[PDB]
């Protein structure tokens, strides 16, 4: 089944998010579990030996195996296929030093599976190479992701860099009335307060409750998007004294599908803060925590499939995401999301977790 890789990719990506959320407590995070899986699958082909095994053990599948790469191409045209061009955009890219002799015949093999190539720049001209990468990412995210490689992120000794960038601005199936958008207090992790704009809409919302093994319970809503393929899942503890760390530290891609399963449509008035969040995640510590340590370590990383002439290791592995949730305007019991909540964008036919993050301060 082609949906067999969608669950492995999302289970791996959500696990990466947990490491990010654990290290980024109290800070806003927008992340793409499918994005880190898609680009780490590309890195599998460039690695070999022990480095490649660490990746395959953590991801749970081999990009070489039969049908895996064609299924991922089918999954990509599945998520970026319902005319979502102006709503969602992404790009994967690996950049290696340009005068470094690569394995002859590897690029046509890399291209056969991903229909892209590993890009080559001269990192010895640091700012030109930084510019070329930033321009490639920006022109491939419809101009929405700027300066992914910040000043100083690479120098003249950089030899290999992995980048991943996604933009999302999906319109809800039923818009929030612009008239109902009001100012309301938001309660933050430190007990302080800030007034922010919040949308509002009463509707029959797909909803369920969820109680962690210790007895604290949560509200979980589903907001459908136009096209009836994607939806955003909102989740927050009912009690403001319970930190979102409790939810994210047991979070699973499987658990999200269980939430959706036990959901029923109830008439609710929902107020939900507008947020426009942009996050750059340094994937080093998260991927190391999941056993992928060799790829970042000099003279330990095995990239012999990409180059058996010179040693290589990943100087930078970065994901930059930008998400926007607005009224989506076109032409009763209450749920107040006035505390740190969790959001999940999900492709319901495939179970793919496209986006995931915490709103600690909108």
């Amino acid at each position: 089944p082609p949906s067999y890789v969608a669950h492995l990719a999302s289970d791996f990506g959500v696990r990466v998010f947990q490491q990010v959320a654990q290290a980024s407590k109290d800070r806003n995070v927008v992340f793409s579990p499918y994005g880190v899986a898609s680009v780490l699958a590309m890195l599998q082909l460039t690695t070999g030996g022990e480095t490649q095994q660490q990746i395959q053990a953590a991801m749970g599948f081999k990009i070489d195996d039969k049908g895996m790469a064609p299924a991922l191409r089918h999954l990509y045209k599945e998520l970026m296929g319902p005319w979502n061009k102006d709503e969602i955009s992404t790009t994967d890219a690996i950049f290696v030093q340009r005068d470094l002799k690569l394995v002859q015949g590897f690029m046509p093999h890399f291209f056969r599976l991903f229909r892209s190539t590993v890009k080559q720049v001269d990192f010895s001209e640091v700012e030109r190479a930084r510019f070329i990468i930033n321009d490639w990412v920006k022109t491939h995210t419809k101009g929405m992701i700027s300066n992914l490689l910040g000043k100083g992120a690479v120098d003249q000794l950089t030899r290999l860099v992995l980048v991943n960038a996604l933009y999302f601005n999906g319109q809800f199936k039923t818009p929030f009335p612009d008239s109902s958008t009001h100012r309301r207090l938001f309660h933050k992790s430190d007990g302080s307060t800030v007034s922010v704009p919040m949308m509002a809409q009463t509707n029959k919302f797909n909803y369920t409750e969820f109680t962690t093994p210790d007895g604290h319970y949560y509200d979980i809503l589903e907001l459908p998007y136009h096209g009836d393929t994607l939806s955003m899942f909102i989740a927050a503890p009912y009690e403001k004294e319970v930190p979102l760390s409790a939810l994210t530290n047991i979070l699973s891609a499987q658990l999200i599908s269980h939430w959706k399963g036990n959901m029923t449509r109830l008439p609710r008035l929902l107020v939900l803060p507008k947020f426009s969040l942009e996050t750059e995640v340094d994937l080093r510590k998260p991927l190391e925590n999941l056993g992928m340590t060799d790829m970042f370590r000099q003279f330990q990383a095995d990239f012999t499939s990409l180059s058996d002439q010179e040693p290589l290791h990943v100087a930078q592995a970065l994901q930059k995401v930008k998400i926007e949730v607005n009224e989506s305007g076109t032409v009763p019991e209450e749920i107040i999301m006035d505390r740190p909540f969790l959001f999940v964008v999900r492709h319901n036919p495939t179970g793919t977790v496209l986006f995931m993050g915490q709103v600690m301060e909108p």
Partner: nanobody
Framework: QVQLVESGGGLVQPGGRLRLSCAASGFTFRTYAMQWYRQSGTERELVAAISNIGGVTDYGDSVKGRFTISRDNAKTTVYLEMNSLKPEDTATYYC?????????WGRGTQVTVS
């Protein structure tokens, strides 16, 4: 009307098996988390705990991977599969339903190993 009646306990030899059970009634089982405790002039120690859905489980240090807690919300039951039993496990095992700040308790079941 709120009642949690546990069963399944008994006497086994070291290394034996035991399958605990607790029928629930009188409240909204689907929204409550289910747990399992144990006692013998001591305090009631947490053994296992499960989320209302999703199968998120939690266990004490003494259980390791020997006990597995499950539930069937349609049949309103929480289970406790006890394998590889040892003399340290001899205790009265109580069930409990919790949707904070509301907690309900059972009557207990005695598990004794040689």
């Amino acid at each position: 009307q709120v009642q949690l009646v546990e069963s399944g306990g008994g006497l086994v030899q070291p290394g034996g098996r035991l399958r605990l059970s607790c029928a629930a009634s009188g409240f909204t089982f689907r929204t409550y988390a289910m747990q399992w405790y144990r006692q013998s002039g001591t305090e009631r120690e947490l053994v296992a705990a499960i989320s209302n859905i999703g199968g998120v489980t939690d266990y004490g240090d003494s259980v390791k991977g020997r006990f597995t807690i499950s539930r069937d919300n349609a049949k309103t039951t929480v289970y406790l599969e006890m394998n590889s039993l040892k003399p340290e496990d001899t205790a009265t095992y109580y069930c409990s339903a919790v949707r904070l700040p509301q907690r309900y308790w059972g009557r207990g079941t005695q598990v004794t190993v040689s």
